[PDB]
Design a protein around this nucleic acid. Structure first.
Lengths: 91, 70, 117, 178
RNA sequence: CCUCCUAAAGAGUAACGGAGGAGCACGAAGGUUGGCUAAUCCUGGUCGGACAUCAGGAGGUUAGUGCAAUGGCAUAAGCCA
RNA sequence: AGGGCUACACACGUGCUACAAUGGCGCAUACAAAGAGAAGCGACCUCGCGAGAGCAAGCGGACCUCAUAAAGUGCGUCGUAGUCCGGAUUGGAGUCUGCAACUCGACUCCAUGAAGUCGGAAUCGCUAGUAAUCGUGGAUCAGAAUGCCACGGUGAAUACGU
RNA sequence: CGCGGGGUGGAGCAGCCUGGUAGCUCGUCGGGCUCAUAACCCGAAGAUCGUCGGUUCAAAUCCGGCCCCCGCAACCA
């Protein structure tokens, strides 16, 4: 497995949208490119609309999902199935 | 009742009190008391940036430099 | 003499024999035999039942095999149930630790099969 | 055996007191336990029935009767009838003897287990103990790598409700499912 | 030629009238004495859960019957020792 | 900025390492050449299961360091059973490079643990310091080498004949 | 309308009797080589026996009904 070594992460990038969102508890999907950012306790119950390079995907953030980054729930690649080829991308 | 077919009792009735020489006298958890999730919930338990162990020498709060030594 | 029974491999080196109660690989079995005063290269048929007891106590703290093989199963299932990328790669069988798909799908998904073009 | 004289001494009196019954006769006693080991297949070969006997033998040494289909007209394969179960009937003192081995030695054998709901009792307070495997009473080199061969343990009763039904083997500690 | 029917409830009565079936089989597939209960669906279940045996309910011999049909059926021509 | 060149259905070119016991395992032991490192790499030190770590002598490279170069040497160990060879997948943590490790990064480690037993069609270089085979360093190089370039260890059959 | 023969994997056959086992020769599709095609080599797909029904644990086979192709048939003259 891989990690974040030793220094302190909230993500610098995500921080300025989040600090105003936690003040409300949760508010409308935070337009986010910051797919580089991990999930944490402060973030439980937010809604992060997560750019995947093509478009945003809402990730509803919750306690069972704190072992993960935001970038994992929103897909990137397409996989050609092999009964017959894959027609669509899947969200 | 078929009286005559009943086996000898040599290895039935003996020693329901036996020891642990290869196996237990009662098993735990065979009734499954929690369903196993196989997760720890990381950063919910434990810390968002890791344990600091290994290489313990007092830390210098004053600047230090790979090129600075001759 | 079987280590714990139910599934143990018969007439195996002393190191190898504990690789079937699980939670006890080579590293832990090597040190557990040195403790109990057993040499590595004896076959398991050479041990008396009181050496088998000295093994069995030192095992009995570790995970029982029915939960060990269940644990990797529930980990795979956990990941698919989140739909995180670990889990997405699991649906197809494809690498989860960054490995290539252009080759070396074989270890997870089995032998190659013919595909008309 | 000790089981039934205990069941008389302890359980029969519980149920008389607890239900406010009008007769002592209204109480359950233990009635015959046939067993099954519904192994199947081997229609001429009868080999998986000898493999069933080597499992049954570990817990009760008695001769397999080896069942045949009784009208032989079902949707299963028919050819020279069809072999199904094994029996091994437990009756009277031999069954009272068997139930005294159950719990004390049956519980250390199972390690992964999903049978035996106490709600699953219905109708007569009839039950069938789907144990998933063989409950091996004391033997040498019984573990050998093998499969399957659980048996129905079909307990029967002179019980006339479900509640009085579920109350056999209760002053015996089993971890029954809810 | 048998069994169901035309066929008119004795007399079973035509027609290249309607339909199913038979050309043997079995040295037990016979006799006698004694005991006994199913097709099927559900609940219990390890594999019988869908089908099966075991055990419980419902139904009450509707299964079976050497072979077609008719009659028959707990006294069980049904099943067994 | 995020995604991507490293997708995945498969097939194909190429290289690696293995399929053994001439070897692998363990403890102990030996000598290179050549070159890179003052954005950098570094002994001793103490810490860390190991990786690594902080401290810091040092190093302009025939000085100090990568580096104990490995194959090779000693001794016991294993018997064709995919093993005592091979160690891939995957669960999980510890650590590294970096303001970012999820698809697409590097290292240690615990448990569990497979294909492969000399490979169809296909297919190429070599005449001797070569072919074969081991280890090393370096260019590139924030983080990724099986590659490439060069170095040195050990080093083969035969070339009648046109 | 009668009477009789015939109805096999994409193509042409084997199997055929109370029936159980789908075989032969091609062709097809993917791949290799060849500068390319080719033959060649490797791998692979393919059957509700014309259709429907009956008996059975099993029906191409043995049976009942029908459609269609052909021979007869289109009078005894």
């Amino acid at each position: 497995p891989r990690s974040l070594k030793k220094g302190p992460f909230i993500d610098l990038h995500l921080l300025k949208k989040v600090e105003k969102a936690v003040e409300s508890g949760d508010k409308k999907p935070l337009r986010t490119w910051s797919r580089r950012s991990t999930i944490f306790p402060n973030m439980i119950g937010l809604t992060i609309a997560v750019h995947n390079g093509r478009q945003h995907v809402p990730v509803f953030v919750t306690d069972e999902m704190v072992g993960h980054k935001l970038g994992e729930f929103a897909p990137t690649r397409t996989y050609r199935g092999h009964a017959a080829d894959k027609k669509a991308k899947k969200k | 009742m078929k009286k005559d077919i009943h086996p000898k009792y040599e290895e039935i009735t003996a020693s329901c009190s036996c020891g642990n020489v290869m196996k237990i006298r009662s098993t735990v958890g065979h009734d499954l008391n929690l369903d196993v999730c196989s997760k720890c919930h990381p950063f919910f338990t434990g810390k968002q940036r890791d344990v600091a162990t290994g290489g313990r020498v007092d830390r210098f709060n004053k600047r230090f430099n790979i090129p600075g030594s001759k | 003499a079987r280590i714990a029974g139910i599934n143990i491999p018969d007439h195996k080196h002393a190191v190898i024999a504990l690789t079937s109660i699980y939670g006890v690989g080579k590293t832990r079995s090597k040190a557990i035999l040195a403790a109990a005063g057993i040499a590595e290269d004896v076959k398991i048929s050479e041990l008396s039942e009181g050496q088998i007891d000295t093994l069995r106590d030192e095992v009995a703290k570790f995970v029982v095999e029915g939960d060990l093989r269940r644990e990797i199963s529930m980990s795979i299932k956990r990941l698919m149930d989140l739909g995180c990328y670990r889990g997405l790669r699991h649906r197809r069988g494809l690498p989860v630790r960054g490995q290539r798909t252009k080759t070396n799908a074989r270890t997870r998904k089995g032998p190659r099969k013919p595909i008309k073009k | 055996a000790k089981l039934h004289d205990y069941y008389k001494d302890e359980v029969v009196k519980k149920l008389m007191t607890e239900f406010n019954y009008n007769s002592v006769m209204q109480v359950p006693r233990v009635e015959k336990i046939t067993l099954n080991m519904g192994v199947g297949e081997a229609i001429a070969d009868k080999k998986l029935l000898d493999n069933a006997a080597a499992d049954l033998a570990a817990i009760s040494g008695q001769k397999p009767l080896i069942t045949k289909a009784r009208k032989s007209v079902a949707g299963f394969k028919i050819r020279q009838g069809y072999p199904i179960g094994c029996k091994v009937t437990l009756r009277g003192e031999r069954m009272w003897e068997f139930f005294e081995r159950l719990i004390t030695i049956a519980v250390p054998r199972i390690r992964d287990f999903r049978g035996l709901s106490a709600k699953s009792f219905d109708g007569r307070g009839n039950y069938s103990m789907g144990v998933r495997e063989q409950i091996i009473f004391p033997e040498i080199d019984y573990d050998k790598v093998d499969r399957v061969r659980g048996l129905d343990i079909t307990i029967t009763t002179t019980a006339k409700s479900d509640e009085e039904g579920r109350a056999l083997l209760a002053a015996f500690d089993f971890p029954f499912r809810k």
